[model samples]
Target chain A: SLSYRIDVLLFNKFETLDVFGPVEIFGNLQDDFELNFISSDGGLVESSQKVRVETSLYTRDENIEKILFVPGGSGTREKVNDDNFINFIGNMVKESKYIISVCTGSALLSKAGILNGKRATTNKRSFKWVTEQNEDVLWVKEARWVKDGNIYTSSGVSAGIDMTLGFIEDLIGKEKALEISRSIEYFWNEDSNYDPFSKIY
Target chain B: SYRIDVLLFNKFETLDVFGPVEIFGNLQDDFELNFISSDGGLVESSQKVRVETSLYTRDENIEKILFVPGGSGTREKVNDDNFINFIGNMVKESKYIISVCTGSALLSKAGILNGKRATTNKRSFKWVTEQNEDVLWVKEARWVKDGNIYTSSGVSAGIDMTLGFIEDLIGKEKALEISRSIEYFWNEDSNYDPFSKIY
Candidate 1:
């Protein structure tokens, strides 16, 4: 294999950490990944904090042999209504080996009708509103992160980094994963079943 | 009121750039954080991801808290007497100087961390630590702080050190709240590191 392909899907008003937390982790293994930014209409995308990043326009070529990462932000609410974008994500995730979402990003997947009858989670602060979009999806209340098949979702902003660590362990081995956490001096939380933010947020 | 200025440069490591940022963002309203780069355009990380920043040399107000992060770029920059001197002059007035990973190496080059107990990215241990002549270098530490100078291990360790810095400056409750908000387990100990076994 040449390199693992990763397309970090971007949207306007996306949460900075929701994207950067995991982005930082994956950034470590640059040699193994062909990372690119993807958006509905590729160009400069801004975060809720007003941080701007550039993205490539989708060419309907994203399917299998790629990892699709969806991040959440205040702008996510506007995206659920964009049928063209929703349909685009829905199509790509069907063939994509992994579908990773952070914070309210699950709303986009749910709106795409992909999380139907699947167990998932999202940012607790926006849980009430995010879950309202798709009542059919099984959204856990107390979970730092959740894994249902190849789809992994996390609660809120910082949780995305923790969840991505688990995702890395899945792709590589535990040694590499532990090496990353240790390098950062991070106390790795492997248990996803435990979540306290469900009550606090 | 502290304004944290994060110094960004081309080919800076990704996690080293944003891991500490998440910790700062948690405080949210209290501190003003700015991402500063050499030319104020988009600076790509080692992974080729681009981020925008303000011009560091152009800013006139100056910041009280200066955070310098590390990456592959630091390896070549340590030899740049001009680059090191730029950083040295920038931090002459800073109240606190914090560095992450090999960022400590750059700090060492600047003479800001002279006569301080500190550490650097262990994977690049030989090269990073070799840059400093006066630092009381520790072989194994999640982070090492000598007075106002804070230095952490590589990459993600920046988050843990940021949390520790938050606890020191703000309070334990605020620090704990930020960790909880991000669902992170705070590793506050400066020593007792396991990475030394491998690195």
Candidate 2:
């Protein structure tokens, strides 16, 4: 018996696709994965698109090995300044098996000091704002996603799916990842470094 | 303003509805969205994503845009006559109808896609086509549009279909702008479906 528990941290005004694109991929693997949506207050958290999701209240769990997911949107701009939330991200980073962020979510991860010396990338549209959060991070501008050790950071909204699939290929197998993508009829960008949007933004 | 009504059921696919919702939500001023179900309140997706929904009510005067997403629930729902009748009424009342994956199966069961060209999840293509014998189901389309009715291949294909629908509703420039803004590298060609061969 094998399983991976995913803890998704939600907040108001988070990007819809930034969270769900990756969620859709992870959710497809019902047997291998367990997903829990969580928020600061433990209630319904609304996205920028006004799609609301019911979530559990955040609680510290250093004993369990879990995948910690943070999504980016207008909410990340507000959350980066919240010390309690930033500290929670920092603490979770220490205990989690893997840490992932989508869009401006890397801003909060950087703000929390976990990305201080790591190589990462974020939403190209918000590249400047996200980069300014931490000067220690070596940011890559031409990547759909960047994976350094246990932390994975994706470029923007839809890139989260590609990053998650790449992570799945690593954690599970390439065959399983491809099977899921094909089942959903998604034309997956197999290459993490192949980002055409990088030049656009 | 065009009102877009998304029909929800238990165990519906997550991205099937939300992917299009994300695109439509971006153009907020032009389109007003309602997540509606027979007994609305909370509709849970197969992935455990629960969304707040409103109860469905018929309004013949309003030319509503109907959206339906498919999942494992569709297998059981196809047998439910009450749900099928409600869907049939919606298809008749809609100005435009959109379905994702096996959702077209529901439309087929509702007896609306008869003599109309459509598409569905390639993995379940045989099962979906078997739902209705009169419908002309395309085997190699990213999406198929016959009149105001649009049917996409599968879960994520809805995103591409929605963008194409947006192009038809607005303009290609608006659709391109939305695609770039989201950084979604959309497969713009509805005819160029590579996934069709895989399954």
Candidate 3:
């Protein structure tokens, strides 16, 4: 099996779980995936919890392979309007095999106009505010995650773990995915439509 | 208000740290959480996610809640005496000791869980249990709480164990608040693990 090279795009103040939850799942695959924290300058990018990430800098001629994973936080509000950053994301999205966003990361992708006509979802707590960022994209009301074509969006922080489990099964097989779930003792909710927080929380 | 120091290191498992973190993170106004590494720099998890931390030193002394996360690094950590010595010192001062996955191996090596009842990641069940000789080990447990020390199974079990800790410290309501915010289903039992037979 070929390794899935996933470049996780980073910026200042990204959510901690939004990025690492999926990274943990993919990294547990036992040599099937490679996750790289990448940024424009390749320095320490701090998360919302004040934890910083040591990231790789993008160099010229670098290739986009399978995924361009983005995490959302208070920082997404800044990246959503940064044209130069959006252009960078847009270019990478154009070259990658899939675009995945967790939490408010959908807002960043939507701001880049890639999800203009696609269906997506975001953190239910910020649903109202995040929905205002994009009008053309079909914003789901009740979903743990929503996958349209090559794009995957999760509802919130921990939801990324569930989405990644489902995504891994779709990318590889259920056996490998279930193996990870069992190893973690996670009761995976494979149905993307299963979400209870949108209405109550 | 107690300070919970989460000890992290190179190759530490991502979920092992974050599962409890996401639970403790929601209690920001109450608990002061700090992520510390032996060396003050960027520590990369086995998954390639690098988290920055303040350096750990013996000079800082206090009664605190200490958390050690487990990963593939444990295979190497067991052989490092200098690292184990540092962990041994922290455990000596900690009012409560918590470990996830193979992290229990660290306590076992540090000689804290030697006479204490504990558990480890089931996937590495044999490998971890074999680390210590005198400890009373539980085979089927999402988490095991022997007095003030809490130990849980692999990755996701950390969340369940932390929730139980919160339930004991703060109340059941606050613990539920943390789990509900993440849209996580609370598995509240310390003896409810389903992976024991499989592994």
Candidate 4:
């Protein structure tokens, strides 16, 4: 609905790769999307190493639009089980044009009921937990990126960059996305049979 | 030929400590620097992340600047009298000292900042003040330098404080050159301003 939009949610104990990999990709987008780093509280959120990440916005900001990306790490388990955080994700999903989760992030998305019956993939370690949540969800293994309609899920940390590139292609034209891919020097494996949309189960 | 000793404890914020360590470590081109840990062997981070140490905590070397970094593991180690005594003794002899993030809390417990002014991660400011009521605290500053003791707010601010130290030790031009090389935007916004509110 909007011209361009993105929000990357970070928390204490968040995996550095989960946030940085996607941020690097979105930061390099040719479409000029507005990207923001957000947290539940606007103050500094510590990473696993106690590195404080100063966020630009808060989750309750009314300026939010379009896309919301939640990344996972040691913090995800606690945040996913938190009622307030799950509710916030649910609310964002309702407003966002698309929702994305990377690594164990999908588990939080599932807790929010956004990934129910949707095809998805998470970190290889948590694939079983994701599938057990709902029988209707067609969870696929071996896929680096899983796309079901507008919701996207990516495998472990660095894979978010690839998934974001694929998403940019779907939103804009393939040419522009390809241009970004070249800029990042990401090798595109187009022949890989990792499509989650295809029915196997 | 004096040396500055920086002890990076277990689970220490790699960026918070490394950002400053890299700056001081590279200063070995003109100054000697040593990176040490408690185990004196291979020290693992709180996440079980391991890093090799050049020396052990028991080293008898006297340092000009004894820099201690804070991390999640600090809470577990703060009550250890041996560790606190080690840090306190270093502070007593060092010409200058710096603490980053919750590392200030440890300093507070060690009774180092009894009358000195300092700052730490904003979230821990309340706890820090409670730990030592005699010390003055600055909340909004990126870093605080009062006399020979320096402390910074949160993680990335360590880089800013390190640059300030470099400027004091060398020259502003050299610090500016290093900041440029690192692609860091030098914002004077956080420089030590004495007339600021204490949090």
Candidate 5:
């Protein structure tokens, strides 16, 4: 069976929007993709709202086409600064085809050196902090979603859904992405000017 | 104090109820909220999700606002006479009755919408109409709030409708503030227009 494995890394205090928004979109694309929630250890991960998420796999198993989706929340801000987690994420980045981050999740990517000299956007609250971690990374202010090479980043929580839709368009087609957007009655603004390369810091 | 009660049945829609609950919970700074369920304890959502309920159906506390949420599992129990009777009794004491998605189907089975306008998830429109001939079904609206009785089209519409309800209950300014806090746009254009083919 043809399967595209997308792994979502979960952590404590993770924003609900970071996980739920993408889950709604990616789950709807079950026909072509298979999603697996993975964490450092295989157990229940709590969200910012105290909701517990049970995952099926752990990070040790690397035999899959990995799309590392790290979501940002208060928990990420605490964990991203750790040496072991940063190294783990760096290892995952080297093995994965696409690396996606939502909100301050871009900060985690930056801490791992994956976002150095790369252009990205993140939660407005974390923009300054993320820039401090990597001075070479071009931070775009006006963009809701930013794509640099194979790395994708989004602003805040809900904007991750918009970025995921853009990723879907790249993987599937515009029509399929539009269909999903219509299914949720969410208006997709693809024409918004968010070109990171054109903007000078 | 004006209080609103939400009844979360077994296998309830988490988002449908939580969406409105989150909005109203925020509104609780201005109003009273009593999250309840038939079991009066922990209630599980349709997909095995669980939430705690604070009150029972027969409780003496009267509610100014009452809401019934519909989910995939609701389709199986909408016609159950016991559940319908419980809903019917709650409707009698409530000043306002709101249903979301196929939850309207349950209200129809409860005989509460015999002569009122309502809406449900577009996919379940035919089934809702078939439940009662007296109910006027509006297909285009994301939600319809008529004479203390409010109903929404589908799952997410509950958020928009709840914000509208909050606006009606408190005022535009408070509701607008809450909407802005959540980064959701709240305005006249946000009002549900059933005729819009956007859905």
Candidate 6:
């Protein structure tokens, strides 16, 4: 009944829109969601577009109810191989009440062995590279987003915002989600199965 | 080419600024961004996103473009003559002027948007139009372009407007390429705004 803490993982060169688009939605509903940015070391993290964000260091804590949000960007490619980062994600996934990923963020979740046997989706442009990460997982080729249990994964940059609004709709209600969307003057694509970009790339 | 001077203020909306930032940042070679506020320091958005800003100045000589973002902050900023005067002077010298949502309210207060077609956030349309009646405020546009001035509806609408501006400066092919690269579904038509009907 209190606020839900959303820990957004920030790595170097994260996509600007991939992170901020969802962040903006969550920020709008600040009453119910507490937003925090976390990194392996905790400091200033820069985006591929050269925007800098200040973040806190990630540490294991099971006492808090936290939702883990992973954003995909150029940094995800390098981070997928980083054992320290992957290990942190694995540890957090076990404790997080919900796990949400955007764009190629699913790649890191797959690398961490957390998405095994779960239906997921990633950036359509880099679908091949992401799908190759884990063959055990059910990767939906033609989906704007996929939901399996408590985990949610979405397609490319702008799709994250749509997925996040959908997630909000799931957690709260459709009215709140629609209100936020209209408040921002966003034309939200409401269907998860509707994937227009799947054929493009 | 001159830098795209993004004027920021406290309690400013996040996407209103960053949506355009993300789009323009893609064309780094063609556009340089200079984040400026009334003063030089870190300015925090209403959502608590903090951006490091340079001091607002009118000295740069290249083809000037001024960009303004609207938020909850605009209501208070409209009464600030010093801030409004800066926007007025900036608009006077700028080769291109752009504003998102209530950012146009400040431009209206600055008296530069008089006799020009413009638009603002649909929800705040009543308040913004009340700011200056001289503006030819179009009621049903996702974005309105008048001469060198460009004004968009609300927050996310800025993304579409920025892409439209990119198309104007560059070409449709470059705009499409950028849209595809980012995997964004662009509202190609500026007149197609359904949000106007809702609010």
Residue-wise C-alpha lDDT for candidate 1, range A37-119, written one tens digit per residue: 88888878877665667788754443326788999877888888888888988977876778999988899988988889999
Q: RMSD per prediction, one decimal?
A: 2.8, 1.6, 2.3, 16.9, 4.8, 1.6
Could you report the DockQ of all the candidates, in the order they appear?
0.45, 0.74, 0.62, 0.02, 0.21, 0.69
RMSD of 2: 1.6
Taking the tens digit of each residue's C-alpha lDDT, what string does model 5 give over B15-103?
Answer: 56655654676654454666677666567664444445666544455446778887776778886788889888778887788887788
Better of 2 and 3 by TM-score: 2
Q: What DockQ does model 5 achieve? A: 0.21
lDDT of each: 0.79, 0.87, 0.83, 0.67, 0.71, 0.88
* Local distance difference test, candidate 4: 0.67
Q: What tens digits encode model 3's per-residue C-alpha lDDT throughout B23-104?
A: 7877877777788988867788887777778875443444588999899888998888988998998888888999999999
**Residue B119 displacement in candidate 6 (angstroms):** 0.3
On TM-score, who's better, 3 or 4? 3
Candidate 6 residue lDDT tens string, B48-102 = 8877788866665577789999999999999999999888888888899999999
Candidate 4 per-residue lDDT, tens place, A78-98, comes to 887799988877877777878
Query: Each model's TM-score?
Result: 0.88, 0.96, 0.92, 0.49, 0.77, 0.96
Pairs of residues clashing in candidate 5: B11-B45, B11-B46, B140-B194, B141-B194
Which ranges of candidate 6 are over 4 A from the true structure?
Answer: A59-63, B57-61
Per-residue accuracy of model 2 over B5-99 as CA lDDT, tens digit each: 99999999888988998899888887878889989888899988988888877666656899999988899999999999999887778889999
lDDT ranking from best candidate downward = 6, 2, 3, 1, 5, 4
List the candidate 5 regions with Cα displacement exceeding 4 Å: A39-46, A50-52, A56-63, A81-94, A192-201, B1-71, B82-98, B185-199
Q: Candidate 1, clashing residue pairs?
A: A123-A156, A184-B156, A184-B157
Docking class of 6: medium
**Candidate 1 per-residue lDDT over residues B31-133, each given as its tens digit:** 7777787678788888777877887643446447889988888878788787788788778867788998899889988877778888877777778777676
Instruction: For model 5, state the Cα shift of residue B55 in Å.
Output: 9.0
